[PDB]
Design a protein around this nucleic acid. Structure first.
Lengths: 87, 73, 80, 89, 73, 76, 74, 160, 82
RNA sequence: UCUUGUUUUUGGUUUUUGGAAAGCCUCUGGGCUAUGCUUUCCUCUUGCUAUUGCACUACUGGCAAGC
């Protein structure tokens, strides 16, 4: 009922805006391993289906990257989303 | 849901609470909650040193609580 | 649910348990809850160190419990 | 059930019970073993077998068997074991 | 006279705002929208870690779990 | 007897100064007067101050806290 | 749902928990929170063992489930 | 009466007296088809059967106790640690091991701590105890007697 | 009105699952629930700081699941429809 | 018709181990990184000897030394 109202106006609208614009996104995770990809679909919990993902993460400092085709992310692991446009 | 806990027998009696972060408190039990939020009066800290600081009336959160004891039978 | 009724049925007997704290408590159980609150007496605590103590009365929060350990005759009890 | 006494009480309880189980398995299935280290009960154990013939054979063949250094003394228990009573009725 | 959290965030919208996380980091920036869960959204945000700017990101949303603080610059 | 939310309602009217402790952080505490609150235990503090074990009193302004992070609310 | 979970009933299980510990034994009772009841339980902290008996775990504490053996006729 | 999958599936299964999951297999001549137990047992009781060789096991990571009383064991297989890595207790009472050298394959069982070989002809061979201690040093209790330091040293002289 | 409903379609394929615990799990999916609790068939799971061990019937307390790395052959557009 | 807001499923993160202070050893790369050791803080194994007792178990002798 009221769930329909917030998808248009609120914070989550900018993904709906970006994902419809065919946009890429930078996501900071709770694993201390950021995700850089383009989104397919999302949800109220921030359960997101990502495509063509690439990680960035330090070690013991060494940075390491891996390409993943399809990825369902449970929104619990997400802590911060940066909805950056190409234009 | 919301089983109002059995804290009627502790009302207006001294306590020895334990909370998250290994911190603990003494006080007279005034009132309790569905979620186990607590009202304590004459609240005294028990620091890791053992230095006991008087505070007064205090509202401890439910989530935090680990346990609740009785000093005197 | 049955995992709660078994608990209520061990009221009176002596119970062992483990908390997120890390310590285990042993004693006669007086009252329980659907939340998994507990009310025990003559408790004999044993932490990670091995430090024993005595606690006259105790209340708990279920959220803080990891798991219980219950007497053996409580396996023939009925499951409805 | 057989009652054993004169056992080396320095063995830890769980090791004692596991060696007891191993040793006595040669005569028949051992249903359970009761052994405590209290002052009263130390150096003793009750070994319970499914079959009665197994208990009698164990008793005669292991009388005075050196176990962890001492010769064990075996005898038939005074009463029936709780587990046996429950399994019978 | 009482000032409640919804009305507070309904009046905070648009102005400069700094909000911490549970893990120390504190981000400043103007506010666009506020859900029923709080669940913040920011634009032109610069991440201040230990009182030190790290990376200017721009358009942002923070999950409402991690938010520790809400106030203003 | 005294229920918990009725106790917090007194702290609004009296405008009493109250120090707030955090969930998993003993090193930090807070201060300030209470303007308003809600059902989920979120609080709007006024003239709030960040305090430490060192006693490093750092000023903030009018802020809001999430109810998930509180532990103690204490008068004066 | 919970159609799969009833199928596991009365099998010897290997249950990993968030602590890392792994409990083992048959499954007598099951819940919507995934509260498990287990019979004749053993932990394997790791070259280690302990005997408990009847154990009632919470949902918070449980990670994964795995069948050790088929359902017993005993 | 071949040890078969069908045989294992109708076999008494229970939690034993020392709190371990045990399978009851108490006239099998050859140990085979253990795959069907699915590595779900801590103990397997093979007492009172006609097995000749302790061999034929699949990879069984659980299996910690093997009770093999009153069989006809005259030889021990060579790859036992590769199929039974955590074998901790082996009870071989009243079997047919006759030569000290036939006990050699037990040296490869790294976790083997409880060993019983009583009522085997090999027992009466000169230096049987010292031989086992030096060749299977991982054993702590042999024939229900504590392996002591003095015996270890004595077994270090002889056989050094 | 949930993305969970899409995972009920997912059944049958193999996936390497990561958890909050930090484990990794290759295995075929049999069934997926509304509360995320998945059951797996013919599994090869590896623990953080231990050797990989094969399990037959693994099942996971959904709460712990970080992400599914889906196979590359699966069409998303078709599954996102009710 | 709903099921992400304190006790479970839409995360408060993580478990002899970890952190801090200099020295030594080993490995890798072109004085850096990792590991262990060395100092401080927060039942098990040696000897010895006691007990001979009919049970259903947190645990179970005491004394000295080692961890």
């Amino acid at each position: 009922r009221l769930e329909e109202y917030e998808f248009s106006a609120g914070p989550l609208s900018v993904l709906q805006q970006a994902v419809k614009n065919h946009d890429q996104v930078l996501i900071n995770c709770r694993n201390n391993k950021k995700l850089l990809a383009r989104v397919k679909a999302f949800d109220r919990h921030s359960n997101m289906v990502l495509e063509n993902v690439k990680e960035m993460w330090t070690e013991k400092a060494i940075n390491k990257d891996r390409f993943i085709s399809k990825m369902f992310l449970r929104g619990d692991g997400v802590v911060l989303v940066v909805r950056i446009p190409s234009a | 849901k919301a089983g109002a806990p059995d804290l009627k027998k502790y009302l207006d009696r001294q306590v020895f609470v334990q909370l998250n972060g290994s911190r603990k408190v003494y006080g007279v039990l005034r009132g309790y909650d569905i979620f186990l939020n607590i009202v304590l009066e004459d609240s005294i800290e028990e620091k890791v040193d053992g230095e006991k600081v008087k505070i007064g009336s205090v509202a401890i959160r439910g989530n935090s609580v680990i346990m609740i004891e009785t000093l005197d039978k | 649910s049955l995992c709660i009724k078994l608990l209520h049925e061990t009221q009176g007997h002596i119970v062992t348990m483990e908390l997120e704290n890390g310590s285990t408590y042993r004693g006669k159980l007086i009252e329980a809850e659907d939340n998994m609150n507990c009310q025990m007496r003559d408790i004999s605590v044993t932490a990670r160190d091995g430090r024993v103590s005595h606690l006259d009365q105790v209340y708990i929060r279920g959220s803080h419990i990891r798991f219980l350990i219950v007497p053996d005759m409580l396996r023939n009890a009925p499951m409805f | 059930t057989l009652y054993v006494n004169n056992l080396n009480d320095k063995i830890n309880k769980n090791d004692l019970r596991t060696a007891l189980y191993m040793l006595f398995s040669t005569y028949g299935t051992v249903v359970d073993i009761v052994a405590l280290k209290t002052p009263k009960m130390r150096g003793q154990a009750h070994v319970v077998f499914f079959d009665p013939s197994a208990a009698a054979i164990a008793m005669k063949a292991l009388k005075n068997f050196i176990f962890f250094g001492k010769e064990m003394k075996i005898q038939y228990a005074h009463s029936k074991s709780k587990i046996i009573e429950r399994i019978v009725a | 006279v009482p000032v409640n959290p919804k009305p507070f965030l309904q009046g905070l919208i648009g102005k400069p705002v700094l909000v911490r996380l549970k893990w120390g980091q504190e981000y400043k920036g103007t506010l666009q929208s506020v859900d029923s869960y709080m669940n913040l959204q920011l634009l032109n945000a610069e991440e201040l870690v230990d009182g030190v700017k790290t990376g200017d990101l721009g358009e942002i949303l923070i999950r409402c779990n991690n938010v520790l603080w809400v106030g203003e610059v | 007897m005294i229920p918990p939310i009725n106790f917090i309602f007194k702290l609004l009217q009296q405008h009493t100064p109250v120090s707030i402790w955090l969930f998993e952080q003993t090193d930090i505490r807070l201060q300030g007067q209470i303007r308003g609150f809600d059902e989920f235990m979120n609080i709007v503090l006024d003239d709030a101050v960040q305090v430490d074990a060192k006693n490093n009193k750092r000023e903030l302004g009018r802020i809001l806290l999430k109810g998930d992070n509180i532990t103690l609310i204490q008068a004066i | 749902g919970t159609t799969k979970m009833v199928s596991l009933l009365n099998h010897s299980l290997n249950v990993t928990t968030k602590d890392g510990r792994t409990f083992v034994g048959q499954l007598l009772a099951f819940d919507g929170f995934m509260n498990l009841v287990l019979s004749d339980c053993q932990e394997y902290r790791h070259e280690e063992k302990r005997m408990l008996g009847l154990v009632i775990l919470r949902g918070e504490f449980i990670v994964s489930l795995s069948v050790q053996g088929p359902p017993p006729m005993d | 009466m071949r040890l078969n999958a069908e045989f294992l599936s109708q076999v008494p299964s229970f939690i034993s007296p020392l709190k371990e999951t045990e399978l009851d297999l108490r006239q099998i001549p050859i140990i085979e088809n253990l795959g069907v137990l699915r590595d779900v047992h801590d103990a397997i009781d093979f007492t009172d059967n006609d097995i000749r060789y302790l061999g034929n096991f699949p990879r069984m990571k659980r299996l910690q106790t093997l009770l093999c009383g009153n069989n006809r064991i005259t030889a021990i297989a060579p790859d036992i640690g590769k199929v039974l890595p955590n074998l901790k207790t082996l009870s071989l009472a009243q079997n047919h091991l006759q030569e000290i050298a036939d006990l050699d394959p037990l040296a490869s069982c790294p976790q083997l701590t409880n060993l019983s070989c009583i009522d085997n002809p090999v027992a009466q061979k000169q230096y049987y105890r010292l031989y086992l201690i030096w060749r299977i040093p991982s054993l702590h209790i042999l024939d229900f007697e504590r392996v002591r330091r003095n015996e270890r040293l004595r077994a270090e002289e002889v056989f050094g | 009105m949930k993305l969970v409903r899409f995972l009920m379609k997912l059944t049958n394929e193999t996936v390497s699952i990561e958890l909050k615990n930090g484990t990794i799990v290759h295995g075929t999916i049999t069934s997926v629930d509304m509360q995320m609790n998945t059951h797996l068939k013919a599994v090869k799971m590896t623990v953080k700081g231990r050797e990989p061990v094969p399990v037959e019937t693994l099942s996971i307390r959904g709460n712990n699941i970080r992400y599914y790395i889906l196979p590359d052959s699966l069409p998303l557009d078709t599954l996102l429809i009710d």
